[PDB]
Amino acid sequence: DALPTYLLDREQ
Amino acid sequence: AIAGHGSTILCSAFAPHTSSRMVTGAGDNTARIWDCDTQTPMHTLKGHYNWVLCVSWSPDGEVIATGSMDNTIRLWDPKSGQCLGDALRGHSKWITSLSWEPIHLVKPGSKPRLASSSKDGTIKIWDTVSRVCQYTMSGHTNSVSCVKWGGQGLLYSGSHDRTVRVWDINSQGRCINILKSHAHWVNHLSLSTDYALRIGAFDHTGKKPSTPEEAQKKALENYEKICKKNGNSEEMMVTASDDYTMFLWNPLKSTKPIARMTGHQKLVNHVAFSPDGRYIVSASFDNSIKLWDGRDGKFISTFRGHVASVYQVAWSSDCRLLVSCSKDTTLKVWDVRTRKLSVDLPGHKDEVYTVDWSVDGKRVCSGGKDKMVRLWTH
Numbered sequence: 001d002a003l004p005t006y007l008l009d010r011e012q
Numbered sequence: 013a014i015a016g017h018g019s020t021i022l023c024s025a026f027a028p029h030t031s032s033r034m035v036t037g038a039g040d041n042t043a044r045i046w047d048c049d050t051q052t053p054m055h056t057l058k059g060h061y062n063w064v065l066c067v068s069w070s071p072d073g074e075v076i077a078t079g080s081m082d083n084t085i086r087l088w089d090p091k092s093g094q095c096l097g098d099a100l101r102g103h104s105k106w107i108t109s110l111s112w113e114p115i116h117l118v119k120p121g122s123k124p125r126l127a128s129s130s131k132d133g134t135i136k137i138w139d140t141v142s143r144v145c146q147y148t149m150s151g152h153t154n155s156v157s158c159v160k161w162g163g164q165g166l167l168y169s170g171s172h173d174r175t176v177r178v179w180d181i182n183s184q185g186r187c188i189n190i191l192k193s194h195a196h197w198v199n200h201l202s203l204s205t206d207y208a209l210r211i212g213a214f215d216h217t218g219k220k221p222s223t224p225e226e227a228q229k230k231a232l233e234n235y236e237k238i239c240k241k242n243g244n245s246e247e248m249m250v251t252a253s254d255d256y257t258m259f260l261w262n263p264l265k266s267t268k269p270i271a272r273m274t275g276h277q278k279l280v281n282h283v284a285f286s287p288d289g290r291y292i293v294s295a296s297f298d299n300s301i302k303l304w305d306g307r308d309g310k311f312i313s314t315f316r317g318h319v320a321s322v323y324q325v326a327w328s329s330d331c332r333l334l335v336s337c338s339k340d341t342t343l344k345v346w347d348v349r350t351r352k353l354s355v356d357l358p359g360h361k362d363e364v365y366t367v368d369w370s371v372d373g374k375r376v377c378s379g380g381k382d383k384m385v386r387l388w389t390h
Binding site for chain 1: 020023038106108157200281323366
């Protein structure tokens with residue numbers, strides 16, 4: 001997935 | 013538009029001394045330094061076992077720090093492309109932020125320390141030269157979102173525990189204040205001076221000091237240029253959280269918020285003071301960007317045109333324009349004077365995760381889910 005710092009622990 | 017990254021880009025930063033150099037980090041476990049003059053790769057930084065989440069230059073320009081999903085930090089030489097030794101271990105979860113000690117609080121001829129925050133709820137102070145964990149600031153009861161090394165010997169950290177903590181570097185890691193105003197995840201944090209803190213002794217022309225003494229001079233010179241507007245040094249702080257609000261602080265002066273600036277309809281993911289601390293700008297998931305007064309925190313105007321959630325904003329050095337990236341694959345640079353859009357940019361094919369203005373205000377960089385770096389020149 002490779003999400004940025006702010007998008008980790010975030011869902012759709 | 014230049015390729016060279018095998019995975020989605022997660023972060024980027026221009027060099028504090030020139031608009032020709034830029035470092036970046038992606039999920040291909042590597043980092044890359046670029047030549048903005050020729051739009052081509054320069055060095056590849058390898059030695060991380062997982063995604064490179066955040067990159068941060070040194071305010072002197074000598075060292076590049078990098079944080080990663082592999083719970084480690086690596087220091088690098090921007091010209092050679094070599095790891096300056098072994099990794100910096102002691103974090104149990106991924107790195108979330110990097111913050112360098114400003115040159116003016118750094119002895120001449122000596123190198124500035126490094127601060128890093130992680131999902132482990134701690135913040136470690138490292139000695140970049142001697143390679144060691146000097147301090148380990150713990151006490152947060154959830155993930156630490158952002159840390160900033162203030163130009164007044166204080167470090168401010170925001171975390172998922174709805175709390176912003178103040179740390180004293182002149183008391184060897186002692187915590188002097190704990191700010192509890194927010195009601196949800198503190199997502200980001202910006203100081204009124206962290207443009208001066210970022211560029212240290214350099215300036216808008218790129219003029220370098222000739223001697224470590226001069227570097228100690230201009231560092232305090234550039235910092236006092238901005239943080240002083242009344243006769244004494246005063247630095248402000250804004251925090252953003254998932255409670256749709258923000259708080260303006262003068263933490264050392266008072267443990268109580270100057271203002272509760274509200275109006276966003278969804279969470280505020282990013283906030284950034286102007287290079288001169290005059291304006292405050294906030295990006296939110298309600299597709300909006302709101303403009304506030306940097307002095308008292310009063311609402312000024314709303315920037316509209318994004319169709320999806322705004323992820324991040326970057327100020328130009330001239331404090332008139334600013335660029336934003338969003339989920340809707342587009343980049344937009346706004347004009348603070350017209351209080352509306354300046355020009356719309358040809359954006360990417362997928363989500364844009366990171367942006368940055370060059371220090372001299374010449375070039376703008378971006379990168380995201382299409383694994384492609386793009387450079388724009390004003």
